[PDB]
């Protein structure tokens, strides 16, 4: 099945998921000079104060920190969105080296990693229904560069040794996702897709302009994870990013000049 290797990587995904070659695939290169400022875009509203994290899981492709999404506890609103989008999980994509790892690029620049906070439109009732809708999801993407440590990330880093291999999960309560956010909520936005199979075209992407800095030690611990299950041959979980896809008939809008 699909993955990030030579024989099952992103260039192969279209054979099982034909939408891989669709009209609104993600990620994309964000050309900052051709994005258009849209003064009518509203400020993002990130309401994470009541977030209830549950657990952290290694799913063989990344690790997800999952949240209780059965009430409006951690929601994204405003910006380009109509309605209320609930946080269900966040995860990262990262590289084998600091010069790569992000999915979106900025003027072709790759960051060391990229955080995805995945939210779904409450009007569709559950995540499964939402991914079937063109406005079903809102993913907040945040770039990571290597520099100073991010204190709010360290609790994630420290639990990774308990979910080294595919299928392992651990309790991960009381984690505050606000500790992963940059100062500025200035953003780019465009319509796109999940960046892993099933690659469904259901996402309003909101990519923050300002990266967060993480330490080399922090991203090194991401790179010690494994794609494989326990007792299978060890393959480090690195370079779990899909490269930029054609923009096609889309315009990236910016909340800022
Ligand atoms: O690509 C993603 O972020 C994704 C794919 C499937 C399910 N949830 C998220
Ligand atoms: Zn992702």
Query: 169-186 burial by CB neighbour count: b if 16+ within 10 A, else e?
Result: beebeebebeebbeeebe
Tell me if residue 15 falls in helix, strand or coil.
helix
Contact between 207 and 29 under an 8 Å Cβ cutoff? The reply is no
Q: How far apart are CA 151 and CA 164, in angstroms?
A: 21
Q: Is 226 in the pocket of ligand 1 (CB under 6 A)?
A: no
Domains of the chain, by residue range, sit at: 1-257
* Experimental technique used to determine this entry: X-ray
Closest CA to 165 of 68, 233, 106: 233
> For the chain, how big is the Rg over CA atoms in Å?
17
Tell me if residue 121 falls in helix, strand or coil.
strand
Task: Enter the tokens of residue 2.
Answer: 């699909």
Tell me if residue 211 falls in helix, strand or coil.
coil
Task: Enter the tokens of residue 206.
Answer: 């909101």
Is 14 marked active-site? no
Task: Enter the tokens of residue 140.
Answer: 């907040």
Tell me if residue 242 falls in helix, strand or coil.
coil
Going by alpha carbons, the residue nearest to atom 4 of ligand 1 is 194
Q: Is 116 in the pocket of ligand 1 (CB under 6 A)?
A: yes
Quote the ligand 1 centre to 45 CA distance (angstroms): 22
**DSSP letters of 137-155?**
EEEEEEEEEESS--GGGHH
Binding-site residue positions for substrate: 195-196
Going by alpha carbons, the residue nearest to atom 2 of ligand 1 is 194
Residue among 7, 14, 33, 61 flagged as catalytic:
61
């Amino acid at each position: 099945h699909w993955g990030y290797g030579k024989h099952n990587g992103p260039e192969h995904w279209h054979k099982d998921f034909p939408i891989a070659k669709g009209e609104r695939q993600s990620p994309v290169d964000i050309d900052t000079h051709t994005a258009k400022y849209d003064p009518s875009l509203k400020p993002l509203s990130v309401s994470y104060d009541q977030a209830t994290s549950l657990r952290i899981l290694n799913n063989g492709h990344a690790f997800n920190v999952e949240f209780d999404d059965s009430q409006d506890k951690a929601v994204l609103k405003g910006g380009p969105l109509d309605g209320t989008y609930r946080l269900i999980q966040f995860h990262f994509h990262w590289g084998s080296l600091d010069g790569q790892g992000s999915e979106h690029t900025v003027d072709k620049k790759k960051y060391a990693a990229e955080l995805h906070l995945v939210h779904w439109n409450t009007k569709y009732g559950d995540f499964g229904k939402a991914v079937q809708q063109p406005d079903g999801l809102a993913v907040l993407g945040i770039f990571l560069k290597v520099g100073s440590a991010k204190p709010g990330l360290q609790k994630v880093v420290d639990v990774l040794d308990s979910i080294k291999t595919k299928g392992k999960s651990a309790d991960f309560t009381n984690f505050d996702p606000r500790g992963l956010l940059p100062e500025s909520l200035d953003y780019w936005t465009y319509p796109g897709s999940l960046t892993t199979p099933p690659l469904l075209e259901c996402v309003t992407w909101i990519v923050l302009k300002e990266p967060i800095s993480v330490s080399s030690e922090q991203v090194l611990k991401f790179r010690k994870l494994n794609f494989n299950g326990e007792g299978e041959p060890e393959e480090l979980m690195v370079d779990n990013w899909r490269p930029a896809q054609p923009l096609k008939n889309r315009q990236i809008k910016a909340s800022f000049k």
